[PDB]
Amino acid sequence: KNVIIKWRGKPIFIRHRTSEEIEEANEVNVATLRDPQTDDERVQKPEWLVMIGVCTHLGCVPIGEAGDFGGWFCPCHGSHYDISGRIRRGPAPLNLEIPEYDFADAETLVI
Amino acid sequence: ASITSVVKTSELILKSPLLSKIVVPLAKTYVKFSGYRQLGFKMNDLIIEETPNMQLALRRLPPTESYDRVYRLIRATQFSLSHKLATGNDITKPEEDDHYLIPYILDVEAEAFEKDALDNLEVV
Amino acid sequence: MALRKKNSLLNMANSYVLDSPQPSNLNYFWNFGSLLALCLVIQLATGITLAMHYTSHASLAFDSVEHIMRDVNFGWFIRYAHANTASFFFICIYAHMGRNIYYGSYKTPRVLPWSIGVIIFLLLIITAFMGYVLVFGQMSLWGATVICNLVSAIPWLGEDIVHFLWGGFSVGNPTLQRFFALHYLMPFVLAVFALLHLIALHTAGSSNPLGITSNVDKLSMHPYYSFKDLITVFAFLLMFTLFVFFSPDKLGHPDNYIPANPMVTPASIVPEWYLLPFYAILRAIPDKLGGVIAMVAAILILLILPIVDRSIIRGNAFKPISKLLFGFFICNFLLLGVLGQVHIEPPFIVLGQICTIFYFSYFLILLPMVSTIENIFFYIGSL
Amino acid sequence: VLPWSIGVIIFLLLIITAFMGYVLVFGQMSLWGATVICNLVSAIPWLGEDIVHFLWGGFSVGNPTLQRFFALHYLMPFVLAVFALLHLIALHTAGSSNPLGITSNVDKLS
Amino acid sequence: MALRKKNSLLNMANSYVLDSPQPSNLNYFWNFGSLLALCLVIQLATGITLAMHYT
Amino acid sequence: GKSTYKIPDFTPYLKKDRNTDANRLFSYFMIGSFGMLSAAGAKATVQDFLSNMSASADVLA
Amino acid sequence: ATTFYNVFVKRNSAFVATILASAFVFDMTFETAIDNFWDRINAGKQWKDIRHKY
Amino acid sequence: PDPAIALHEAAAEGPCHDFKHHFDECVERVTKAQEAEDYDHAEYKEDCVEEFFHLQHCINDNTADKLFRVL
Amino acid sequence: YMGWWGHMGSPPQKGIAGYTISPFAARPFAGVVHAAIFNTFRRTKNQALFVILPVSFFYYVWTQASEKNEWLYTKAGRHELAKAL
Amino acid sequence: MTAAEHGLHPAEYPWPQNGMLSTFDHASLRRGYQVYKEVCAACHSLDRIAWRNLVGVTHTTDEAKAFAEELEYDDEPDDEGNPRKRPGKLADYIPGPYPNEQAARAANQGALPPDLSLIAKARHGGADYIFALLTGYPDEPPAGVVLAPGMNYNPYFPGGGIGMARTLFDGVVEYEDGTPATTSQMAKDVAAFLTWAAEPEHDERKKLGLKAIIVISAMLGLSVYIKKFKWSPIKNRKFIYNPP
Amino acid sequence: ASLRRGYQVYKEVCAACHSLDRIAWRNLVGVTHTTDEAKAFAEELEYDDEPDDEG
Ligand code: HEC
Ligand code: HEM
Ligand code: HEM
Ligand code: HEM
Ligand code: HEM
Ligand SMILES: CCCCCC[C@H]1C(=O)O[C@H](C)[C@H](NC(=O)c2cccc(NC=O)c2O)C(=O)O[C@@H](C)[C@@H]1OC(=O)CC(C)C
Ligand code: FES
């Protein structure tokens, strides 16, 4: 599941990623990525994808679970984000920004 | 810039035959296009005077030359505000465009530059 | 002795607006000074009036400007007058600076009025930028976001400074309230500097289009320049009228009539037209910090004109090569303006870089070369 | 006389400035102060009522009044600073008086 | 000639705050003028600051 | 060119009827028209501009 | 014509009074004249032209 | 019925005939290209927007004044 | 560098006689038609090159740049755009 | 950018109000309000316009009060502090179809219909853009355009895909004045109406500008005579120099 | 310690009729209560959120 938390007006996508989702994200060779990053750089905890859910192209909010890399699809110009929230296809230049988030408890994070 | 600089550089150019052959005709056309003669000015009337050196040089002008300069400036100011040009005898002919002020300012500056040099002398 | 000379207070007015001795041959380009004074007065009158109807809270700002347009008697006029006069202020200020560059008003003995002038020009930019934000439309927000994120390029402290100016982590209510206070204040500071540059000028008096002394032939400021200033006041008011009453939105950007939305980014963020040349200069440098420095340097480099102009003659009236160079400089400054509003696409990227190099090379290379050569041509040519 | 006379105007501007600033809080004293003080203007014959409504921007003290007092309270201190500077320029012709009331032209200190 | 006297701008500051000739015997009641200047500055500083937070 | 008592030629600009009241009156008609429009314009400007301070449409409602 | 000058122009108090009275008259008449002109060039367009239907 | 329909048709057959034919030929090419297999796995998919804009821009230039004259 | 009336800082003037007539004695618009036509023609002709040269050059530059830009973002210009990025 | 990405620029139509001396056609404004009320108001708000604004522009006071009185607005709470509704008055603003953005987007497949009070000033093109957009839906999108789901092709809208479907069809409105309600007629009327909504001072502003232009022109003419008059002693000055 | 006791009086007696509208839960933290105690007080109440996706 992916949650949408407003944080400074901007939406925050929080996905509770499954084991096989993590695996799917850890596949793509870093080499072939507009914005080259691995999931380990993005998440500080593999079960908590926390991103700023604003598309890096112009600034629409991607519809999650949709896409072609089954992560997030920006409907505006058709840019596809990953399960890491990395850009794969479409006009968007960068991967979906990661806020500064810390796990105060294992059951609560602050953003 | 200093008038001294302008004068020295000009003399270097006039010395070199090659340089003078190409520069002197240019400078003559430049002055024709400049069009200060069409307001009845002599070249030297255009030099910036709000400097201590230039004020001193103007004070050293012979009375006649000074009175004539004041007339040319007033006449030119009047043509400027009327948007007219000089006609007839008011136009400065090339032979009348004499460097009446250059000798005075070169003496003023010679002293001022000597003073600066000598302020920096070192007994060996 | 006449009261206007005897009484100390009256004497100060007298020395500036009545008995002030002026050259008798100032042309129409000497009238932009008084037009800039008129712009500054209109902006204070309309500005103070808008402040009586404006609410600086971000939940209400945009709505308060709609209230001004729709409900306040003549509010449309006061709003459009204020917005358009800001454009006219920059037309007049560019004209006035252009006049000063062409006629060598920056040379001794007028380096001080010129240098204070460069600061007036910076304050006007800051003032007009902050005023733009107060509407809190989309251009307001996205302008403040982008411009204040340039400050992030200041090393080490940049980020901290930005958050301090915004009063928070993004442009929001705190930013809007503080820009309102400062935008109210800055025009008063600008008026004080305008008055200082005049006091500084009073020692030498106005330059004139011939670049010679005017000490030989002076005319009282009144009535001659009083009545000459009225012609351009009425010419200005004709232009003002055409914009304010008949095309009030011609100089503006429609995006500012959409309320600020932090999510949606506008199609294109371009500044107000009068900032466009500096924006083009900034885009020309690929480095973020480099770009900011270049943009500020594009204004501060005017402070070196007194040094780099090596001419023994004041102004360009008599200098055909300098006039051509100045023509190219002014047209390049307009091309920079146009390049500030195109998209960052070929072939405008390289063109913008060439125009930026030309802009700086005027001050650093060409003006020193050309002014040196003209000195030599005047001397040889008149021998 | 001239520095003194300009000073009397500075004193009036200070009263107006401080009165408007008091209104900006919009507490009970703010409101009831603006109500009673601006209803004194109602005593001006013939036009008094009209002037009050014009200053309030309405038929009672409310939002329009508050917004306009904010703008003016911001501005008035700058006017007051200019007059303060004018009374000094006026004073400069005679210089300061002194506690003996005699000339000081004989014995000056920077 | 000293810069503070030569330069027109500096000269105005000079004539008011530095070389201004004053009587030698002003008592403490002549200090309210500068306190009123200080009040006016504090009111501008605090006032402009409040305006950045006031609606 | 030399005599200062030979006043330069001003005939291109001198009005023949220069000392008539008609002549002065005309120039004051121009000045006065200009004063009239400036007064009418200032009244219009002030009245329109200050009306912003009268109750706005929402208040009047 | 001397008479006109002497009465309305010679004293500045009279001249300024004449200018202000003229300004008053101009203001009033110009308002009325523009109103009529504006109504003729915008005929059948304004609310006053269609109001009669209601 | 809608005046615009007639005016647009008239302007397409008349002063904007070259642009009409351009757009038509474009459409023919694109439809044919879409008909062919392994079109979905192509790099560049051609549209007809450019030709459409040239046509519409032309039609509008020839119609604007005429249309507002009949309203 | 500038004084005031009475001591303006002119070098001493002597030998210049200045003459003028009253504004009421002059035709303010004397020879205005001649000036508006012939004088303005003269003054414009003399300054024409200093305006025409830079304006014509920068207009040509802009025209070429804007036409290239337009062409690059057409279908025909796809390939040249791809190389330019 | 591609012209697609910019949107086709709208034609310049000769609106009644174009022209320095031209007001809006108020009969068109009234017709345009009827289009807004019967078509646009389903999805779009007009939040900055009050019922009082229509009075003496499009409607008499009675007609506008009748429109206001048909609606219910939030009153001040009753004496037990329970919420209450009241009938609308002239000072009320025209109410929107949706309570908030989220409701608006949910009803419009994610797209948020903007408020139309300023739309004529908030888009390049103004009335021409609104007219072009409403009339510019082709029967078929140009071959090769891929529309996102819930998008409609419209060349005037930047990007081409707009979340608003074609809405004006011949006879969706029945005008009360017997004007044939063709797509083009309704778009012209509503575009005029929205232009008025964005700039309601337009008629007054241009009349005062006519007065300003005339007076300022006269003062400019006079100021030039006066300048020349006062300067004539300086322009006419002549010198005779005798070198001493 | 008196402030904390006073809050308990406010909460159990005055709050029945009187509001304390200008004080946020965060204001009690490090004055009368630890962050945990204050969050516990806040989390017991319901406040108006932004509308859901159906508005
Ligand atoms: C049932 C829905 C619906 C109706 C009916 C409707 N609209 Fe819209 N409109 C929308 C939606 C949704 C958008 C936003 C489209 C987008 O952002 O993709 C929109 C956008 C607009 C825009 C702005 C497009 C832009 O540039 O951002 C204008 C103008 C507009 N509508 C006017 C009208 C007018 C005028 C009418 C009818 C006379 C109308 N609409 C009828 C739903 C509607
Ligand atoms: C509010 C903005 C400004 C106002 C009101 C203003 C006003 C004036 C006035 C009234 C004058 C004398 C009359 C004239 O020459 O036009 C003047 C002269 C001057 N101004 Fe400005 N000015 C402003 C901004 C600037 C700026 C930005 C500069 C320089 C960058 C500048 C530099 C000068 C200089 C050098 C002079 C002397 C020119 C000369 O007479 O030769 N001023 N200004
Ligand atoms: C040099 C003087 C000034 C300049 C250049 C200037 C410029 C601007 C600009 C450009 C805007 C944006 C206008 C818009 O698009 O709506 C604006 C808005 C504003 N200005 Fe100024 N301004 C000046 C002086 C003042 C002053 C003295 C005040 C006094 C408070 C003021 C109050 C406002 C207010 C309240 C707004 C917001 C309302 C609005 O947008 O119209 N301004 N200003
Ligand atoms: C902002 C308010 C004011 C400021 C900042 C101010 C400042 C000053 C200063 C600095 C001086 C010279 C030093 C001194 O004698 O204390 C002075 C002198 C003076 N002030 Fe004020 N003043 C203000 C208000 C007033 C008022 C309200 C009046 C009169 C009602 C006034 C009348 C004078 C007079 C007459 C002098 C000359 C006194 C003398 O030296 O004998 N001032 N003021
Ligand atoms: C002579 C200078 C000034 C005086 C005598 C003055 C006086 C006052 C007074 C008496 C109040 C009521 C204070 C309260 O009880 O809370 C006040 C409030 C205010 N003043 Fe001033 N003021 C001055 C200058 C300024 C200036 C320059 C600003 C610039 C904006 C300003 C902004 C405010 C604001 C925003 C408030 C309301 C906030 C508040 O009440 O604290 N003041 N002022
Ligand atoms: C009332 C006395 C207070 C002194 C300052 C007031 C103003 C003042 O000095 O006015 C003058 C009329 C001045 N013009 C000139 O110098 C001038 C000189 C030569 C030729 C022309 N034009 C040619 O035909 C001129 O236009 C001007 O407009 O400068 C303002 C900016 C001043 O405002 C200030 O600095 C204070 C503040 C409002 C900026
Ligand atoms: S805005 Fe996200 S795809 Fe273009």
PDB file of N, CA and C in Angstrom, chain G:
ATOM      1  N   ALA G   1     -10.833  94.975 -25.964  1.00  0.00           N
ATOM      2  CA  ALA G   1      -9.638  93.952 -25.669  1.00  0.00           C
ATOM      3  C   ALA G   1      -8.629  94.300 -24.540  1.00  0.00           C
ATOM      4  N   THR G   2      -8.257  95.581 -24.452  1.00  0.00           N
ATOM      5  CA  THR G   2      -7.665  96.172 -23.265  1.00  0.00           C
ATOM      6  C   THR G   2      -8.575  95.968 -22.051  1.00  0.00           C
ATOM      7  N   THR G   3      -9.885  96.210 -22.234  1.00  0.00           N
ATOM      8  CA  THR G   3     -10.873  96.009 -21.187  1.00  0.00           C
ATOM      9  C   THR G   3     -10.810  94.567 -20.706  1.00  0.00           C
ATOM     10  N   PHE G   4     -10.873  93.607 -21.626  1.00  0.00           N
ATOM     11  CA  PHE G   4     -10.781  92.211 -21.233  1.00  0.00           C
ATOM     12  C   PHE G   4      -9.505  91.944 -20.434  1.00  0.00           C
ATOM     13  N   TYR G   5      -8.367  92.450 -20.916  1.00  0.00           N
ATOM     14  CA  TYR G   5      -7.117  92.222 -20.205  1.00  0.00           C
ATOM     15  C   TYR G   5      -7.186  92.792 -18.789  1.00  0.00           C
ATOM     16  N   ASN G   6      -7.656  94.046 -18.683  1.00  0.00           N
ATOM     17  CA  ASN G   6      -7.689  94.787 -17.429  1.00  0.00           C
ATOM     18  C   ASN G   6      -8.567  94.106 -16.391  1.00  0.00           C
ATOM     19  N   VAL G   7      -9.677  93.526 -16.845  1.00  0.00           N
ATOM     20  CA  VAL G   7     -10.620  92.923 -15.931  1.00  0.00           C
ATOM     21  C   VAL G   7     -10.165  91.528 -15.510  1.00  0.00           C
ATOM     22  N   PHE G   8      -9.760  90.685 -16.462  1.00  0.00           N
ATOM     23  CA  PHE G   8      -9.643  89.275 -16.133  1.00  0.00           C
ATOM     24  C   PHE G   8      -8.202  88.833 -15.939  1.00  0.00           C
ATOM     25  N   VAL G   9      -7.253  89.629 -16.407  1.00  0.00           N
ATOM     26  CA  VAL G   9      -5.908  89.094 -16.472  1.00  0.00           C
ATOM     27  C   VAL G   9      -4.933  89.911 -15.639  1.00  0.00           C
ATOM     28  N   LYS G  10      -5.084  91.233 -15.642  1.00  0.00           N
ATOM     29  CA  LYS G  10      -4.101  92.105 -15.014  1.00  0.00           C
ATOM     30  C   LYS G  10      -3.840  91.732 -13.549  1.00  0.00           C
ATOM     31  N   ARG G  11      -4.885  91.609 -12.717  1.00  0.00           N
ATOM     32  CA  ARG G  11      -4.683  91.200 -11.329  1.00  0.00           C
ATOM     33  C   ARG G  11      -4.599  89.680 -11.287  1.00  0.00           C
ATOM     34  N   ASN G  12      -3.583  89.125 -10.621  1.00  0.00           N
ATOM     35  CA  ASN G  12      -3.460  87.678 -10.577  1.00  0.00           C
ATOM     36  C   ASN G  12      -4.623  87.065  -9.804  1.00  0.00           C
ATOM     37  N   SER G  13      -5.086  87.756  -8.770  1.00  0.00           N
ATOM     38  CA  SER G  13      -6.237  87.260  -8.041  1.00  0.00           C
ATOM     39  C   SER G  13      -7.412  87.092  -9.006  1.00  0.00           C
ATOM     40  N   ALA G  14      -7.586  88.019  -9.954  1.00  0.00           N
ATOM     41  CA  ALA G  14      -8.683  87.923 -10.909  1.00  0.00           C
ATOM     42  C   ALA G  14      -8.435  86.810 -11.919  1.00  0.00           C
ATOM     43  N   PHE G  15      -7.182  86.675 -12.342  1.00  0.00           N
ATOM     44  CA  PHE G  15      -6.794  85.681 -13.325  1.00  0.00           C
ATOM     45  C   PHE G  15      -6.982  84.290 -12.748  1.00  0.00           C
ATOM     46  N   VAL G  16      -6.585  84.094 -11.499  1.00  0.00           N
ATOM     47  CA  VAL G  16      -6.730  82.777 -10.918  1.00  0.00           C
ATOM     48  C   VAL G  16      -8.207  82.508 -10.685  1.00  0.00           C
ATOM     49  N   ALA G  17      -8.965  83.517 -10.258  1.00  0.00           N
ATOM     50  CA  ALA G  17     -10.399  83.334 -10.091  1.00  0.00           C
ATOM     51  C   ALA G  17     -11.071  82.963 -11.417  1.00  0.00           C
ATOM     52  N   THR G  18     -10.646  83.584 -12.520  1.00  0.00           N
ATOM     53  CA  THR G  18     -11.173  83.330 -13.852  1.00  0.00           C
ATOM     54  C   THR G  18     -10.846  81.903 -14.284  1.00  0.00           C
ATOM     55  N   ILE G  19      -9.624  81.460 -13.988  1.00  0.00           N
ATOM     56  CA  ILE G  19      -9.161  80.142 -14.371  1.00  0.00           C
ATOM     57  C   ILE G  19      -9.983  79.100 -13.621  1.00  0.00           C
ATOM     58  N   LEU G  20     -10.198  79.297 -12.317  1.00  0.00           N
ATOM     59  CA  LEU G  20     -10.924  78.320 -11.522  1.00  0.00           C
ATOM     60  C   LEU G  20     -12.394  78.291 -11.905  1.00  0.00           C
ATOM     61  N   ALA G  21     -12.986  79.448 -12.213  1.00  0.00           N
ATOM     62  CA  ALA G  21     -14.377  79.457 -12.637  1.00  0.00           C
ATOM     63  C   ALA G  21     -14.512  78.763 -13.989  1.00  0.00           C
ATOM     64  N   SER G  22     -13.533  78.976 -14.869  1.00  0.00           N
ATOM     65  CA  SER G  22     -13.497  78.314 -16.162  1.00  0.00           C
ATOM     66  C   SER G  22     -13.344  76.810 -15.984  1.00  0.00           C
ATOM     67  N   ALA G  23     -12.520  76.403 -15.019  1.00  0.00           N
ATOM     68  CA  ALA G  23     -12.268  75.002 -14.744  1.00  0.00           C
ATOM     69  C   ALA G  23     -13.559  74.334 -14.301  1.00  0.00           C
ATOM     70  N   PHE G  24     -14.323  75.027 -13.451  1.00  0.00           N
ATOM     71  CA  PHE G  24     -15.609  74.544 -12.985  1.00  0.00           C
ATOM     72  C   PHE G  24     -16.538  74.337 -14.177  1.00  0.00           C
ATOM     73  N   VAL G  25     -16.623  75.335 -15.058  1.00  0.00           N
ATOM     74  CA  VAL G  25     -17.548  75.269 -16.178  1.00  0.00           C
ATOM     75  C   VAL G  25     -17.096  74.182 -17.144  1.00  0.00           C
ATOM     76  N   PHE G  26     -15.799  74.146 -17.442  1.00  0.00           N
ATOM     77  CA  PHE G  26     -15.277  73.137 -18.338  1.00  0.00           C
ATOM     78  C   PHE G  26     -15.604  71.751 -17.795  1.00  0.00           C
ATOM     79  N   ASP G  27     -15.242  71.514 -16.541  1.00  0.00           N
ATOM     80  CA  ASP G  27     -15.477  70.230 -15.905  1.00  0.00           C
ATOM     81  C   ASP G  27     -16.926  69.767 -16.067  1.00  0.00           C
ATOM     82  N   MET G  28     -17.896  70.668 -15.863  1.00  0.00           N
ATOM     83  CA  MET G  28     -19.310  70.320 -15.861  1.00  0.00           C
ATOM     84  C   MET G  28     -19.806  70.030 -17.270  1.00  0.00           C
ATOM     85  N   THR G  29     -19.375  70.863 -18.212  1.00  0.00           N
ATOM     86  CA  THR G  29     -19.859  70.778 -19.571  1.00  0.00           C
ATOM     87  C   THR G  29     -19.188  69.615 -20.276  1.00  0.00           C
ATOM     88  N   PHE G  30     -17.910  69.388 -19.977  1.00  0.00           N
ATOM     89  CA  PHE G  30     -17.161  68.343 -20.645  1.00  0.00           C
ATOM     90  C   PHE G  30     -17.699  66.976 -20.239  1.00  0.00           C
ATOM     91  N   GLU G  31     -18.070  66.848 -18.966  1.00  0.00           N
ATOM     92  CA  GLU G  31     -18.692  65.651 -18.430  1.00  0.00           C
ATOM     93  C   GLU G  31     -19.948  65.340 -19.239  1.00  0.00           C
ATOM     94  N   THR G  32     -20.826  66.333 -19.369  1.00  0.00           N
ATOM     95  CA  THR G  32     -22.091  66.175 -20.056  1.00  0.00           C
ATOM     96  C   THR G  32     -21.869  65.829 -21.524  1.00  0.00           C
ATOM     97  N   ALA G  33     -20.879  66.472 -22.145  1.00  0.00           N
ATOM     98  CA  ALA G  33     -20.633  66.319 -23.569  1.00  0.00           C
ATOM     99  C   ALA G  33     -20.093  64.931 -23.863  1.00  0.00           C
ATOM    100  N   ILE G  34     -19.223  64.433 -22.980  1.00  0.00           N
ATOM    101  CA  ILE G  34     -18.603  63.138 -23.203  1.00  0.00           C
ATOM    102  C   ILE G  34     -19.667  62.076 -22.981  1.00  0.00           C
ATOM    103  N   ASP G  35     -20.459  62.225 -21.913  1.00  0.00           N
ATOM    104  CA  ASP G  35     -21.570  61.327 -21.655  1.00  0.00           C
ATOM    105  C   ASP G  35     -22.420  61.153 -22.915  1.00  0.00           C
ATOM    106  N   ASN G  36     -22.826  62.245 -23.583  1.00  0.00           N
ATOM    107  CA  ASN G  36     -23.711  62.128 -24.735  1.00  0.00           C
ATOM    108  C   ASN G  36     -22.983  61.465 -25.899  1.00  0.00           C
ATOM    109  N   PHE G  37     -21.701  61.784 -26.030  1.00  0.00           N
ATOM    110  CA  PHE G  37     -20.954  61.278 -27.159  1.00  0.00           C
ATOM    111  C   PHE G  37     -20.763  59.775 -27.010  1.00  0.00           C
ATOM    112  N   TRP G  38     -20.483  59.368 -25.784  1.00  0.00           N
ATOM    113  CA  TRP G  38     -20.177  57.997 -25.456  1.00  0.00           C
ATOM    114  C   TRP G  38     -21.417  57.146 -25.680  1.00  0.00           C
ATOM    115  N   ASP G  39     -22.593  57.719 -25.403  1.00  0.00           N
ATOM    116  CA  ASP G  39     -23.862  57.026 -25.546  1.00  0.00           C
ATOM    117  C   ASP G  39     -24.209  56.840 -27.017  1.00  0.00           C
ATOM    118  N   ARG G  40     -23.761  57.764 -27.877  1.00  0.00           N
ATOM    119  CA  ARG G  40     -24.080  57.683 -29.297  1.00  0.00           C
ATOM    120  C   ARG G  40     -23.160  56.689 -30.000  1.00  0.00           C
ATOM    121  N   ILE G  41     -21.888  56.652 -29.597  1.00  0.00           N
ATOM    122  CA  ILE G  41     -20.996  55.748 -30.300  1.00  0.00           C
ATOM    123  C   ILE G  41     -21.183  54.312 -29.817  1.00  0.00           C
ATOM    124  N   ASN G  42     -21.793  54.153 -28.640  1.00  0.00           N
ATOM    125  CA  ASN G  42     -22.048  52.842 -28.079  1.00  0.00           C
ATOM    126  C   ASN G  42     -23.558  52.690 -27.993  1.00  0.00           C
ATOM    127  N   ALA G  43     -24.247  52.851 -29.132  1.00  0.00           N
ATOM    128  CA  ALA G  43     -25.701  52.892 -29.120  1.00  0.00           C
ATOM    129  C   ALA G  43     -26.239  51.472 -29.233  1.00  0.00           C
ATOM    130  N   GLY G  44     -27.231  51.155 -28.388  1.00  0.00           N
ATOM    131  CA  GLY G  44     -27.813  49.825 -28.315  1.00  0.00           C
ATOM    132  C   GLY G  44     -26.928  48.825 -27.572  1.00  0.00           C
ATOM    133  N   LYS G  45     -25.790  49.278 -27.042  1.00  0.00           N
ATOM    134  CA  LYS G  45     -24.870  48.347 -26.407  1.00  0.00           C
ATOM    135  C   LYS G  45     -24.982  48.402 -24.891  1.00  0.00           C
ATOM    136  N   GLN G  46     -25.319  49.570 -24.359  1.00  0.00           N
ATOM    137  CA  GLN G  46     -25.159  49.754 -22.930  1.00  0.00           C
ATOM    138  C   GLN G  46     -26.415  49.318 -22.191  1.00  0.00           C
ATOM    139  N   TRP G  47     -26.321  49.207 -20.860  1.00  0.00           N
ATOM    140  CA  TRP G  47     -27.438  48.704 -20.073  1.00  0.00           C
ATOM    141  C   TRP G  47     -28.664  49.598 -20.249  1.00  0.00           C
ATOM    142  N   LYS G  48     -28.427  50.911 -20.218  1.00  0.00           N
ATOM    143  CA  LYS G  48     -29.478  51.897 -20.410  1.00  0.00           C
ATOM    144  C   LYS G  48     -30.248  51.695 -21.723  1.00  0.00           C
ATOM    145  N   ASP G  49     -29.636  51.033 -22.715  1.00  0.00           N
ATOM    146  CA  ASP G  49     -30.284  50.810 -23.997  1.00  0.00           C
ATOM    147  C   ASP G  49     -31.161  49.557 -24.008  1.00  0.00           C
ATOM    148  N   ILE G  50     -30.941  48.631 -23.065  1.00  0.00           N
ATOM    149  CA  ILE G  50     -31.642  47.356 -23.091  1.00  0.00           C
ATOM    150  C   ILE G  50     -32.546  47.232 -21.871  1.00  0.00           C
ATOM    151  N   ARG G  51     -32.323  48.114 -20.907  1.00  0.00           N
ATOM    152  CA  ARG G  51     -33.065  48.118 -19.669  1.00  0.00           C
ATOM    153  C   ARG G  51     -34.575  48.129 -19.932  1.00  0.00           C
ATOM    154  N   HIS G  52     -35.046  48.694 -21.057  1.00  0.00           N
ATOM    155  CA  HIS G  52     -36.480  48.918 -21.242  1.00  0.00           C
ATOM    156  C   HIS G  52     -37.243  47.598 -21.397  1.00  0.00           C
ATOM    157  N   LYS G  53     -36.523  46.536 -21.782  1.00  0.00           N
ATOM    158  CA  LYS G  53     -37.081  45.199 -21.929  1.00  0.00           C
ATOM    159  C   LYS G  53     -37.510  44.590 -20.592  1.00  0.00           C
ATOM    160  N   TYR G  54     -37.055  45.168 -19.469  1.00  0.00           N
ATOM    161  CA  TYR G  54     -37.192  44.571 -18.141  1.00  0.00           C
ATOM    162  C   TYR G  54     -37.934  45.463 -17.091  1.00  0.00           C
TER     163      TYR G  54
END
